[PDB]
């Protein structure tokens, strides 16, 4: 019955999104969420919902929601879905098998690219073992790809575990930056639900 708008404005319209390997997470609570404005925006390239169908989100009440945001390459978007495998779904950001939420993505080629090449976006490439769902790894220790221990210094068979996307305004549509926001619902006194 409380009447205050959810801060959906700042999440989607933030000036800076973090790298895929250090994705942000935000709690939204004690507010009424109007999901109609998002859907009829036509500014989103992809709006896919698992376990819950849109156009009914204005009903239903949730315990608490989650907003995960980052930026990745345009082609790699299809890896953000349950049961998918790849570099992103193994070493960077993995979704559980029982996901109940929606995935929103839209092209951002005119904000995240620079003339000289943007090297401020990175992604993890090597890891000893795959990730568990919703687990984040931030460390930057040197990966040991061979029999000879590296002892914390890089060299032959001692690779740095992070690599740069290198976005540019002239890249193909498959290699352009895309912004992604993942909403997770959990279905306790419900606090967030629309009018």
């Amino acid at each position, epitope marked *: 019955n409380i009447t205050n708008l959810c801060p959906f404005g700042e999440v989607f319209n933030a000036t800076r999104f973090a790298s895929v390997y250090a994705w942000n997470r935000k709690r939204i609570s004690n507010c009424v969420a109007d999901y109609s404005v998002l859907y009829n925006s036509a500014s989103f390239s992809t709006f896919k919902c698992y376990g819950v169908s849109p156009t009914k989100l204005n009903d239903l009440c949730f315990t608490n929601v989650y907003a995960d945001s980052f930026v990745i390459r345009g082609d790699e978007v299809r890896q953000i879905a349950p049961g998918q495998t790849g570099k992103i779904a193994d070493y960077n950001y993995k979704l559980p098998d029982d996901f109940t939420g929606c995935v929103i993505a839209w092209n951002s080629n005119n904000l995240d690219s620079k003339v000289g*090449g943007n090297y401020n976006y990175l992604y993890r490439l090597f890891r000893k073992s795959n990730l568990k769902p919703f687990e984040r790894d931030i460390s930057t220790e040197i990966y040991q790809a061979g029999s000879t221990p590296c002892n914390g210094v*890089e060299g*032959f068979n001692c690779y740095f575990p992070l690599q740069s996307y290198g976005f540019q305004p*002239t890249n193909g549509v498959g290699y352009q930056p895309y912004r992604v926001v993942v909403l997770s619902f959990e279905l306790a006194p419900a606090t967030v639900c629309g009018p």
Partner: single-chain antibody
Amino acid sequence: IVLTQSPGTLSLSPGERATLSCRASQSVSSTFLAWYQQKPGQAPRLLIYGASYMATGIPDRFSGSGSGTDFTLTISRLEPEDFAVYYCQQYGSSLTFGGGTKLEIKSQVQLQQSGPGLVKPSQTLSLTCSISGDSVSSNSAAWNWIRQSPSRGLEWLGRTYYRSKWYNDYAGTVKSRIAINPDTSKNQFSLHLNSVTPEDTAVYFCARVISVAGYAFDIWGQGTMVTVSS
């Protein structure tokens, strides 16, 4: 690991496509293949690192693909200025270049080289590579030395860098008689060879490598030729 350039030589016309091929002796788990284009009389230029990602100020005609033991480069629409040579470089447990294909048709950081160009046989050779626009003791860079001769192609000599202290590496062929010395006071690095032989006649370049950019030779030097003769 040995890289073999599959197409020998191609002759095309303006407008259509071109297709290259690079083959690895065994699997490259590091996946750090890079493609370089060299015009005559000029230092090589970087095109693609990571086998797919574009470099700085490069049009969209060039495309890269491949994985495992094979790789390919594709040119969408040729231009009369594409009279050049194209190489194929890898990194991992070893650093090796490729033979390369000759194709014929019908900026904020600078490296400057200095040193003598002629030396008496059985003497010492000294070269220096001054840096403008960066600090030689950077945390995320390495400084290399490359040399080229027509009989052997492009050859890797040695490298130096600094993470907590100074670290050096050298190629097995030249281990016994090579030295690399940095100097932070005047921000340079120099190469020394105590003994020289007639076959050493070659053209030398100094190059910078950034670890987050696929270990690709980003910025090259002017390069100078050295001839060993009486």
